[PDB]
């Protein structure tokens, strides 16, 4: 078992834009990695395309990251591991670059645009101002957006 296990059928991973070390996604994927180690992801998926974009950008291996979080229960310790593995993550303009692209991500085809709007309309149909994936995640996870 895992002392830092998280059951994501019962809790949400942290917001895409709840930053750590200035970076989006990092807190969220820490949480997903812990649930992945534990076997308690629920509807969430570790190393799905969004995690892959974060790992790819910073040159991190998803398997090594999940292993690293097992001995690093605190965010500061996982952040220090990321820095030690990723020179790009130590450059604040590069982190800002990542964040700007991540926060801009929108449905990349009309097929995906139909899907996005179907999800959003099921959660909050008056919210036509919500057009990016990371804002849709916060909406589904009951955060102010």
């Amino acid at each position: 078992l895992y002392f830092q296990g998280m059951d994501l059928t019962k809790q949400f991973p942290r917001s895409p834009v709840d930053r750590l070390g200035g970076m989006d996604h990092l807190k969220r994927v820490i949480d997903k990695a812990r649930a992945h180690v534990a076997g308690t992801l629920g509807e969430y998926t570790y190393n799905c395309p969004l995690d892959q974009a974060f790992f790819s950008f910073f040159g991190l291996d998803h398997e090594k990251f999940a292993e690293a979080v097992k001995s690093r229960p605190q965010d500061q310790d996982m952040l220090a591991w990321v820095h030690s593995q990723s020179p790009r993550s130590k450059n604040p303009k590069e982190v800002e670059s990542f964040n700007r692209e991540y926060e801009s991500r929108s449905p990349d085809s009309p097929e995906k645009w139909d899907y996005f709007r179907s999800v959003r309309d099921s959660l909050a149909p008056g919210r036509t101002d919500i057009t990016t994936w990371v804002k849709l995640l916060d909406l589904e996870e009951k955060r102010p957006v």
Side-chain angles (χ1 to χ4, degrees):
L1 55 71
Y2 175 45
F3 268 47
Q4 290 280 120
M6 300 297 253
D7 179 356
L8 307 185
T9 71
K10 295 283 174 91
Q11 74 165 274
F12 301 129
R14 284 171 296 172
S15 175
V17 299
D18 182 357
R19 295 177 176 173
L20 176 57
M23 344 182 15
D24 288 346
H25 206 65
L26 176 55
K27 285 188 179 184
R28 183 170 187 84
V29 77
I30 289 167
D31 292 346
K32 292 170 62 187
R34 296 191 197 290
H36 166 77
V37 166
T40 50
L41 280 158
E43 293 182 2
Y44 293 90
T45 297
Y46 181 70
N47 210 33
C48 80
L50 196 57
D51 289 355
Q52 288 170 42
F54 173 83
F55 293 141
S56 180
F57 188 96
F58 293 106
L60 300 170
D61 175 90
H62 62 100
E63 295 175 358
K64 298 183 178 182
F65 182 90
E67 182 62 28
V69 304
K70 302 181 180 178
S71 60
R72 295 171 176 86
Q74 307 311 144
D75 278 355
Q76 280 292 309
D77 290 311
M78 280 304 307
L79 176 61
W81 186 88
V82 168
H83 287 160
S84 78
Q85 298 290 109
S86 179
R88 194 177 192 187
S89 74
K90 299 184 208 177
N91 185 305
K93 292 184 165 68
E94 292 304 299
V95 172
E96 277 145 49
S97 190
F98 172 78
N99 290 349
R100 173 195 177 179
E101 183 169 359
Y102 178 80
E103 292 176 23
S104 76
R105 287 174 181 272
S106 303
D108 71 10
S109 69
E111 179 173 357
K112 286 188 182 168
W113 184 40
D114 292 342
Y115 170 49
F116 180 99
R117 292 182 293 171
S118 184
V119 175
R120 193 200 52 210
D121 289 353
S122 75
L123 293 165
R127 285 309 301 277
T128 52
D129 60 300
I130 295 180
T131 64
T132 56
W133 289 116
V134 299
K135 279 200 176 301
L136 187 63
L137 288 170
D138 272 346
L139 177 71
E140 178 143 357
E141 291 175 350
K142 307 180 176 201
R143 300 193 184 89
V145 175

